Amino acid sequence: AAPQQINDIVHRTITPLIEQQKIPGMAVAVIYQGKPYYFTWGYADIAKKQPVTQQTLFELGSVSKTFTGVLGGDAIARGEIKLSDPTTKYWPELTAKQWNGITLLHLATYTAGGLPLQVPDEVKSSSDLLRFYQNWQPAWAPGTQRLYANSSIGLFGALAVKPSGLSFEQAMKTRVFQPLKLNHTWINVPSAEEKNYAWGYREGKAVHVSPGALDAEAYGVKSTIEDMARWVQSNLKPLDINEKTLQQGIQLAQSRYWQTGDMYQGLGWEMLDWPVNPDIIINGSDNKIALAARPVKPITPPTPAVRASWVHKTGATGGFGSYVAFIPEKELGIVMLANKNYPNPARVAAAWQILNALQ
Numbered sequence: 341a342a343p344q345q346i347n348d349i350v351h352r353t354i355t356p357l358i359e360q361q362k363i364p365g366m367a368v369a370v371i372y373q374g375k376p377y378y379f380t381w382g383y384a385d386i387a388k389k390q391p392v393t394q395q396t397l398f399e400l401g402s403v404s405k406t407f408t409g410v411l412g413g414d415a416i417a418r419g420e421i422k423l424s425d426p427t428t429k430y431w432p433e434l435t436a437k438q439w440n441g442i443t444l445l446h447l448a449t450y451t452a453g454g455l456p457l458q459v460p461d462e463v464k465s466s467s468d469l470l471r472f473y474q475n476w477q478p479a480w481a482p483g484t485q486r487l488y489a490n491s492s493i494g495l496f497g498a499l500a501v502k503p504s505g506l507s508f509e510q511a512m513k514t515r516v517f518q519p520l521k522l523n524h525t526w527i528n529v530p531s532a533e534e535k536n537y538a539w540g541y542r543e544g545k546a547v548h549v550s551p552g553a554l555d556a557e558a559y560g561v562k563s564t565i566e567d568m569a570r571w572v573q574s575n576l577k578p579l580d581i582n583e584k585t586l587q588q589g590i591q592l593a594q595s596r597y598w599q600t601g602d603m604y605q606g607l608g609w610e611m612l613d614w615p616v617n618p619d620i621i622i623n624g625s626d627n628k629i630a631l632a633a634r635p636v637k638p639i640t641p642p643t644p645a646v647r648a649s650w651v652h653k654t655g656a657t658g659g660f661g662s663y664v665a666f667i668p669e670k671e672l673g674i675v676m677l678a679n680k681n682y683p684n685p686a687r688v689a690a691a692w693q694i695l696n697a698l699q
Contacts, residue, residue, distance in 0.1 A: 342377035369569035376569035384538035401655030409608025413589030420503035447496035453478030494554025540659015594645035625684035
């Protein structure tokens with residue numbers, strides 16, 4: 341059981357959300373005074389009447405970028421990479437002149453100059469990727485415009501693990517998932533766990549995310565509400581993490597590297613100063629803003645992680661919609677996982693209503 345104030349605000353907020361958005365299945369975790377409280381609704385598989393449980397796996401979509409950012413932070417802390425390193429240090433075959441000056445920082449923070457939102461579906465092998473990046477022409481100089489992009493942070497993640505000699509998946513398992521005891525968090529769902537993998541629903545049809553280049557880095561993690569609550573706990577309170585470079589990596593992913601308007605770009609995470617204007621976060625989450633190019637101001641050196649922040653990330657796939665938000669100063673956070681991609685502003689409005697009530 342949760343304290344009644346949590347049960348009350350969750351029931352009053354999530355029930356109309358599910359009805360308004362026709363969400364088939366949903367799981368919510370509230371982290372309150374550092375402890376998790378879980379809630380589930382509806383079905384992971386409608387036709388087969390499988391309820392959502394605390395072991396249901398949801399596609400995180402772009403919430404996966406938070407894991408990629410932390411894994412990159414850990415590689416920085418290990419001394420394996422620097423954000424100022426040129427992309428070409430890790431991929432010297434990227435000889436085209438437009439890559440001169442594009443650093444790992446730019447890739448990690450969507451500031452390379454207009455790398456596109458998606459890797460094209462036609463681009464599948466490393467050779468296809470090389471052609472893609474060699475032929476890409478920037479719209480802007482590096483470090484001037486943020487354009488949210490799977491092709492940008494996806495490449496960051498692929499390159500950041502090269503010194504380790506591990507694949508991206510193996511690095512993520514060994515360096516992030518295992519130390520944090522995320523035992524039900526997967527880039528590739530094992531056969532024995534397929535029974536727990538919810539279907540996503542798009543226009544009423546059951547769907548799962550399709551393979552794509554750099555999927556693991558940009559949008560490919562699947563996880564349970566329990567593991568996601570532990571992920572929030574770890575990012576709320578990194579000083580409890582025993583593995584020093586992972587603790588440091590978590591901290592570095594909440595450093596502020598760029599500002600645009602009132603939002604700050606971390607590694608995967610995005611941040612605003614708390615208290616927030618809820619309209620700014622709600623309206624800023626709409627893709628009309630969130631996917632637009634926005635001019636950035638550099639923060640030199642990056643601001644070390646600010647405890648009084650709203651730290652958050654939206655994520656989607658064709659069939660799923662996820663959101664995570666937390667406030668380190670308040671020891672408070674929320675995870676919302678659903679098997680329908682419903683509008684971002686409705687996610688953020690509900691999260692803020694719940695966390696604002698519990699602050």
